Write a protein that binds this ligand. Sequence first.
Ligand SMILES: O=C(O[C@@H]1Cc2c(O)cc(O)cc2O[C@@H]1c1cc(O)c(O)c(O)c1)c1cc(O)c(O)c(O)c1
Ligand SMILES: O=C(O[C@@H]1Cc2c(O)cc(O)cc2O[C@@H]1c1cc(O)c(O)c(O)c1)c1cc(O)c(O)c(O)c1
Ligand SMILES: [Mn+2]
Ligand SMILES: [Mn+2]
Length: 178
Amino acid sequence: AMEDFVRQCFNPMIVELAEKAMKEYGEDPKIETNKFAAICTHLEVCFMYSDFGALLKHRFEIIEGRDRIMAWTVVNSICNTTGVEKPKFLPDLYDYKENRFIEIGVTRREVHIYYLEKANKIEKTHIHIFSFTGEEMATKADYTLDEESRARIKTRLFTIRQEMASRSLWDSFRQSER
Ligand SMILES: O=C(O[C@@H]1Cc2c(O)cc(O)cc2O[C@@H]1c1cc(O)c(O)c(O)c1)c1cc(O)c(O)c(O)c1
Ligand SMILES: O=C(O[C@@H]1Cc2c(O)cc(O)cc2O[C@@H]1c1cc(O)c(O)c(O)c1)c1cc(O)c(O)c(O)c1
Ligand SMILES: [Mn+2]
Ligand SMILES: [Mn+2]
């Protein structure tokens, strides 16, 4: 059962944020278990990406995984102090070094298409897509992180993928992203 996997594979904080998020949108984590696990994955990658952070003490501000009220407080704080334009939707991070917001995507399809669907849904937000195929794609080929950091994100995705596969959950998870 994909539900049981999610609760074994991901830390309880991540799992809880995934539930809250699904319920906010009216979805039952016990029925839409593939989506449940997708959300956990997007969450964990955002935090991983966050935790990689010479000059600045914390290079990234984390925005995903917060209640919307705090998310916008943090986003408006950053905007009102750095002067950067205010997004129309909440992104996932802010980069203090490059002074821009980042929208992380995670797909189990080919990056190039998911990238495009993301970009259309936003415009000054830097997009960075990962996939379970091991690929990635970022606006203007600027991957923000070093290669050490990205490889760790990619390992984690592949680690999730093998643990799914071993329990035959993978192929469903792969097909459900429609
Ligand atoms: O975080 C994911 O969902 C968030 C919660 C959510 C939901 O509950 C229902 C719904 O209609 C939309 C929805 O948008 C949220 C979301 C936030 C993101 O930052 C994001 O990149 C995204 O694809 C989406 C997510 C990410 C994914 O990458 C993904 O494949 C997935 O199935 C889900
Ligand atoms: O609801 C506030 O905090 C949390 C965030 C939040 C949200 O994002 C969307 C939503 O549908 C409800 C919602 O409730 C949350 C909340 C958290 C609590 O710990 C709590 O006791 C509560 O009554 C509720 C809140 C309300 C306020 O009126 C307020 O001034 C404030 O600073 C914060
Ligand atoms: Mn987000
Ligand atoms: Mn995202």
